[PDB]
């Protein structure tokens, strides 16, 4: 019911300052808390009561909160700081413990690399079977975070979009895929459909048409 909103991802160069925000309606009357979860490990408390460090936590970690927002700041990011960060608070009633959706923090550790994007139209066979799937294949990207938007002609498509989490490839880069399900009618009635992949502020779009 009650939600805490965080940016899905943040990139930072080693030694630079990373900021992760957390937005929630009850935060004006409630404390915020931050947890770090490295790959394959249990979470660890790094900030409590908006801005306090538990014993043992490095001083490069700091927090602040005002109104409906709390901010986790890491001043001088180390590679070992690469992890997912969750903000935590209770709902207004104080009956529910809620985490934000979490923020994936990449501390850049290999060459950046734009994603390659391959888009396939529905096959004759599938159409001939009264179904239609667009396949957007996204590979060789780093950092491992991407957002995928879809377009019908020039309009946003949101329903029927299914998109995986990025996976580490054999070469330490990342891959992901997005599927758009349509009725054959929907597909044949537009001049084109487009897959838009956003990576580190830049966007690559591939489009296909019923031809």
């Amino acid at each position: 019911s009650y939600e805490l909103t965080q940016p899905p991802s943040v990139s930072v160069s080693p030694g630079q300052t990373a900021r992760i925000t957390c937005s929630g309606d009850a935060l004006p009357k409630k404390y915020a808390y931050w947890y770090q979860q490295k790959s394959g490990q249990a979470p660890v408390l790094v900030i409590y009561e908006d801005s306090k460090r538990p014993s043992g936590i490095p001083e490069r970690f700091s927090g602040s909160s005002s109104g409906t927002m709390a901010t986790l700041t890491i001043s001088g990011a180390q590679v070992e700081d690469e992890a997912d960060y969750y903000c935590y608070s209770t709902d207004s009633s104080g009956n529910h413990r809620v985490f934000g959706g979490g923020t994936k923090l990449t501390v850049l550790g290999q060459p950046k690399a734009a994603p390659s994007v391959t888009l396939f139209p529905p096959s004759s066979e599938e159409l001939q079977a009264n179904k239609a799937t667009l396949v957007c294949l996204i590979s060789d990207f780093y950092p491992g975070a991407v957002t995928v938007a879809w377009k019908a002609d020039s309009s946003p498509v949101k329903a029927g979009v299914e998109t995986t989490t990025p996976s580490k490839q054999s070469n330490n880069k990342y891959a992901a895929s997005s599927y758009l399900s349509l009725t054959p009618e929907q597909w044949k009635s537009h001049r084109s459909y487009s897959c838009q992949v956003t990576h580190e502020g830049s966007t690559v779009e591939k489009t296909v048409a019923p031809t």
Binding site: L45, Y48, P54, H96, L137, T165, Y179
Partner: protein
């Protein structure tokens, strides 16, 4: 010195029950609020349930209220979670966690988790469609359950330039994946391309010829 170790997780079918335990050592378990927090594969953290030191105060997530029951035995230094009417959506790693005294530091120590997988025993085989074409082609392996499916090309004679993508779990509860291969465009009218899809759970194997 502090230690939280959980157990009881496993593979079960929907509707069934499971009982999780958590053993606490290196501290006076009796003095602390205890919690279950869960995390589905690739997803965020979700509070499940909490219980005060003397069991006087108990809370549940709305998604589990009425199905799960938390309890503890201070003499036995153990936190429990009785899970009834399990659903596929309950699949997660289940963490045990404690609060500091007075709750100043919530979840200040966590176990490593015990894994709970809830899966129908029913199976659906894949519909395999060609992804038709210096050139890329592949196969759409659509609407199957459960994992895994393996894919090869030309009975494994073609390995160079093959990229099989991790599947999407669709809202329907069914999986789909694609395998693509990069090939010479000049070799498209000559070579025949066949993806070999293997879905052991449904005892199905499919060889799809991919044509331009």
């Amino acid at each position: 010195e502090v230690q939280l170790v959980e157990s009881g997780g496993g593979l079960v079918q929907p509707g069934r029950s499971l009982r999780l335990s958590c053993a606490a050592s290196g501290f006076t378990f009796d003095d602390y609020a205890m919690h279950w927090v869960r995390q589905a594969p690739g997803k965020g953290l979700e509070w499940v349930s909490g219980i005060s030191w003397n069991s006087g105060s108990i809370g549940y997530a709305d998604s589990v209220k009425g199905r799960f029951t938390i309890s503890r035995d201070n003499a036995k230094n153990s936190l429990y979670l009785q899970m009834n009417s399990l659903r596929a959506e309950d699949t997660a790693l289940y963490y045990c966690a404690k609060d500091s005294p007075r709750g100043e530091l919530p979840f200040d120590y966590w176990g490593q988790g015990t894994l709970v997988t809830v899966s129908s025993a029913s199976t659906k085989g894949p519909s395999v469609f060609p992804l038709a074409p210096t050139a890329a082609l592949g196969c759409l392996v659509k609407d199957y359950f459960p994992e895994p499916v393996t894919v090869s090309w030309n009975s494994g004679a073609l390995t160079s330039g093959v990229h099989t993508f991790p599947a999407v779990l669709q809202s329907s509860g069914l999986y789909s994946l694609s395998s693509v291969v990069t090939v010479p465009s000049s070799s498209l009218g000559t070579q025949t391309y066949i993806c070999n899809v293997n879905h052991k759970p449904s005892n199905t194997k499919v060889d799809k010829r991919v044509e331009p």
